[PDB]
Amino acid sequence: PAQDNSRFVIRDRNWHPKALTPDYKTSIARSPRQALVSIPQSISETTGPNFSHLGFGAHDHDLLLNFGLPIGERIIVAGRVVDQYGKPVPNTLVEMWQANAGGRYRHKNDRYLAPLDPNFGGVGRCLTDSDGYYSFRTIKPGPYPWRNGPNDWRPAHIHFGISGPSIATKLITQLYFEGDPLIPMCPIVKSIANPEAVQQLIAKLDMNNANPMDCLAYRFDIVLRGQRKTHFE
């Protein structure tokens, strides 16, 4: 079983979005009013699941084949998962979900008028390799309206889930695309008080990784909490 051998750099709660961010309407009723109770790290918090033995299907990471060809901009979304000390995070689980080219989600509750794409599911999973690299092949999602303010539109984005080495590292974020003008107007993006933090979520066009006459590529590196050995404990 798991061993309590590590300590994780404490999260910066001013870097991450606060719970209560009024402009994002839903945050009001869904944010605690009491302060979080800080607790020392124990085996309970410094361990987590290792997905090495999860039986992944052949196209788990290929949104182009995992559901005809979908309609939309063919892109590769790739990057590396590292910790705050810049150490690679190998064999870690990266999960993603997104809307189709029109901003329509293949989910019961999505009533947006953009039609579904018969050849698009919008789910992927990839286990980072030895070097913390992951890659997905998909179509760039379209922005979509949502019932926040009377004219709110989420920028095109991909939802990301990263496990990391423990439950303390586990994170859910969103990737945004370079130059998208919707970015600065989004109340959800704006839950993030520091502009520099916002930058970390923007995927950069990556011509170097594109397949000429095929698809473009975007680079999205992810940084998980720094992992250190315990000392003088």
Partner: protein
């Protein structure tokens, strides 16, 4: 001071989290292998239990789109990190609340005692991470059992909560469902009886 690379910033899971993490729930076809709400196979050692709960918002309204992640020790108080559908018991699981009833379920075994860093035993508990639209950064909590009063009283973690009244918020209430041992663990995000959430 020394500054490391900043950790990638969290973002709400959104209403459609199911599409990525709870396929069956999103009303979508699942894949061969899915991480779900059945941590233990019938033949797994320990006391087989059922966990269930509802998640409420600051208005006392059900949060029908919540996503939950669990991490617990086996009956021996051992964390089994090597996740495999073949295993009799997995320390990790996932669940979500029904869009109708708004209740999640987990099929597991009662966790064994685990010691903290200082060598003091913690009361049996299940670590929970709560995700949903409206939640910018996931909420961490712990589920303790009302039938471990003796152990709960000495939990170094439970004891870190200043106000005893707030400790009660983390105690799941034992019941029976279809002649089976169950525990109900409701989470109140905000207000009256607001559940304790941790930072670590």
């Amino acid at each position: 001071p020394i500054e490391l690379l900043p950790e990638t910033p969290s973002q709400t899971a959104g209403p459609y989290v199911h599409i990525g993490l709870a396929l069956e729930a999103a009303g979508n076809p699942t894949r061969d292998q899915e991480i779900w709400n059945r941590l233990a196979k019938p033949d797994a050692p320990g006391e087989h239990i059922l966990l269930l709960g509802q998640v409420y918002d600051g208005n006392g309204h059900l949060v029908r789109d919540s996503f939950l992640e669990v991490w617990q020790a086996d009956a021996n108080g051992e964390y089994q990190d090597a996740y495999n559908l073949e295993n009799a018991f997995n320390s990790f699981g996932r669940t979500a609340t029904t869009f109708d009833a708004g209740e999640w379920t987990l099929h597991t075994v009662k966790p064994g005692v685990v010691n903290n860093a200082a060598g003091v035993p913690m009361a049996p508990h299940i670590n929970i991470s709560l995700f949903a639209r409206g939640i910018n950064i996931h909420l961490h909590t712990r589920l303790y059992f009302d039938d471990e009063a003796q152990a709960n009283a000495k939990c170094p973690v439970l004891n870190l909560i200043e106000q005893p009244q707030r400790r009660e918020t983390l105690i799941a209430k034992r019941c029976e469902v279809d002649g089976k041992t169950a525990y109900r663990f409701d989470i109140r995000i905000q207000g009256e009886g607001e559940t304790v959430f941790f930072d670590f």
